[PDB]
Scaffold this active site. Structure first.
Site, PDB file in Angstrom:
ATOM      1  N   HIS A  32       0.820  -1.223   0.000  1.00  0.00           N
ATOM      2  CA  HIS A  32       0.000   0.000   0.000  1.00  0.00           C
ATOM      3  C   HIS A  32       0.844   1.259   0.000  1.00  0.00           C
ATOM      4  O   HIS A  32       0.314   2.348  -0.226  1.00  0.00           O
ATOM      5  CB  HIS A  32      -0.978   0.023   1.191  1.00  0.00           C
ATOM      6  N   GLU A  56       0.135  -7.414   0.304  1.00  0.00           N
ATOM      7  CA  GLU A  56       0.907  -6.444   1.072  1.00  0.00           C
ATOM      8  C   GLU A  56       2.410  -6.706   1.038  1.00  0.00           C
ATOM      9  O   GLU A  56       3.160  -5.830   1.449  1.00  0.00           O
ATOM     10  CB  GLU A  56       0.458  -6.322   2.543  1.00  0.00           C
ATOM     11  N   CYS A 141       5.505   2.240   7.305  1.00  0.00           N
ATOM     12  CA  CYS A 141       5.312   0.962   6.636  1.00  0.00           C
ATOM     13  C   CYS A 141       6.393   0.698   5.593  1.00  0.00           C
ATOM     14  O   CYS A 141       6.850   1.603   4.879  1.00  0.00           O
ATOM     15  CB  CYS A 141       3.946   0.909   5.996  1.00  0.00           C
TER      16      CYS A 141
HETATM   17  C1  LIG Z   1       1.890   2.230   7.393  1.00  0.00           C
HETATM   18  O1  LIG Z   1       1.299   2.628   6.199  1.00  0.00           O
HETATM   19  C2  LIG Z   1       0.817   2.187   8.481  1.00  0.00           C
HETATM   20  C3  LIG Z   1       1.484   1.875   9.830  1.00  0.00           C
HETATM   21  C4  LIG Z   1       0.530   1.783  11.027  1.00  0.00           C
HETATM   22  C5  LIG Z   1      -0.419   2.965  11.111  1.00  0.00           C
HETATM   23  C6  LIG Z   1      -0.646   3.167  12.635  1.00  0.00           C
HETATM   24  N1  LIG Z   1       0.522   2.629  13.282  1.00  0.00           N
HETATM   25  C7  LIG Z   1       1.276   1.770  12.288  1.00  0.00           C
HETATM   26  O2  LIG Z   1       2.295   1.183  12.472  1.00  0.00           O
HETATM   27  N2  LIG Z   1      -0.150   1.147   8.218  1.00  0.00           N
HETATM   28  C8  LIG Z   1      -1.560   1.482   8.152  1.00  0.00           C
HETATM   29  O3  LIG Z   1      -1.948   2.591   8.293  1.00  0.00           O
HETATM   30  C9  LIG Z   1      -2.511   0.326   7.894  1.00  0.00           C
HETATM   31  C10 LIG Z   1      -2.708   0.217   6.394  1.00  0.00           C
HETATM   32  C11 LIG Z   1      -3.490  -1.014   5.970  1.00  0.00           C
HETATM   33  C12 LIG Z   1      -3.709  -0.909   4.454  1.00  0.00           C
HETATM   34  C13 LIG Z   1      -4.310  -2.188   3.887  1.00  0.00           C
HETATM   35  C14 LIG Z   1      -3.487  -3.416   4.258  1.00  0.00           C
HETATM   36  C15 LIG Z   1      -3.268  -3.539   5.767  1.00  0.00           C
HETATM   37  C16 LIG Z   1      -2.698  -2.255   6.376  1.00  0.00           C
HETATM   38  N3  LIG Z   1      -3.764   0.505   8.597  1.00  0.00           N
HETATM   39  S1  LIG Z   1      -3.786   0.283  10.283  1.00  0.00           S
HETATM   40  O4  LIG Z   1      -3.949   1.557  10.944  1.00  0.00           O
HETATM   41  O5  LIG Z   1      -2.470  -0.147  10.751  1.00  0.00           O
HETATM   42  C17 LIG Z   1      -5.170  -0.796  10.746  1.00  0.00           C
HETATM   43  C18 LIG Z   1      -5.041  -1.405  12.139  1.00  0.00           C
HETATM   44  C19 LIG Z   1      -4.249  -2.703  12.147  1.00  0.00           C
HETATM   45  C20 LIG Z   1      -4.832  -3.770  13.072  1.00  0.00           C
HETATM   46  C21 LIG Z   1      -3.911  -4.999  13.166  1.00  0.00           C
HETATM   47  C22 LIG Z   1      -4.562  -6.209  13.830  1.00  0.00           C
HETATM   48  C23 LIG Z   1      -3.522  -7.243  14.235  1.00  0.00           C
HETATM   49  C24 LIG Z   1      -4.124  -8.606  14.554  1.00  0.00           C
END
Ligand SMILES: *[C@@H](O)[C@H](C[C@@H]1CCNC1=O)NC(=O)[C@H](CC1CCCCC1)NS(=O)(=O)CCCCCCCC
EC number: 3.6.1.15
Length: 174
Positions: A32, A56, A141
């Site tokens: 992404h 991903e 990321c």
């Molecule tokens: C990097 O782009 C970013 C890093 C995160 C944001 C908040 N703190 C971090 O380390 N990742 C995201 O924003 C992420 C993006 C999605 C896009 C589609 C594919 C998956 C990732 N969204 S998120 O905020 O990290 C969603 C929450 C994750 C929950 C994980 C559950 C674990 C069991």
């Protein structure tokens, strides 16, 4: 140091995030974060780059030796569950923030609509890792998850997600 300067120099700014030079020709990153609708990456046209994306995890293999300063290192098919790895976070502002993580299980996850072949883990940086100083944040990321197989460093994932709590992180794996 924790990690040698040569390992940190593999961590390269890419799209809305970062990627990692596995070898002079292999670059990995998180999907992404990757630019879309472009005719080239790092100056090279698409016809000179073997491009592969799977949930991903994105690999590029360049035809041109892009980072010949580097030797190839092992890319594992996921991190060893239960073991402590290090997320090599670089920041916009110039800080190096290696965040220790104990790795959980490899599992498939739908996350905000996208299918993620991911691996969770728990940061070992505080009671909570909410915020900028102890955890991962937007923009992080693509950072590699690394650990040492004996005397050599290996890489096993790229950073993809974290909870709002902050303690749980997810890397994308092969
Ligand atoms: C990097 O782009 C970013 C890093 C995160 C944001 C908040 N703190 C971090 O380390 N990742 C995201 O924003 C992420 C993006 C999605 C896009 C589609 C594919 C998956 C990732 N969204 S998120 O905020 O990290 C969603 C929450 C994750 C929950 C994980 C559950 C674990 C069991």
């Amino acid at each position: 140091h924790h990690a040698p300067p040569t390992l940190w120099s593999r961590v390269t700014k890419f799209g809305s995030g970062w990627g990692f030079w596995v070898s002079p020709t292999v670059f990995i990153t998180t999907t992404h974060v990757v630019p879309t609708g472009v005719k080239e990456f790092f100056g090279e046209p698409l016809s000179s780059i073997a491009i592969h994306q799977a949930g991903e995890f994105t690999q590029f293999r360049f035809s041109k030796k892009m980072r010949p300063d580097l030797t190839g290192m092992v890319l594992e098919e996921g991190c060893p569950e239960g073991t402590v790895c290090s997320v090599l976070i670089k920041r916009d502002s110039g800080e190096l923030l290696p965040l220790a993580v104990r790795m959980g299980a490899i599992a498939s996850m739908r996350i905000q609509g996208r299918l993620v072949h991911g691996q969770s883990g728990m940061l070992l940086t505080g009671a909570n890792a909410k915020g900028m100083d102890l955890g991962t944040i937007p923009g992080d990321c693509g950072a590699p998850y690394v650990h040492k197989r004996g005397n050599d460093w290996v890489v096993c994932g790229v950073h993809a997600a974290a909870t709002k709590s902050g303690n749980t992180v997810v890397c994308a794996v092969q």
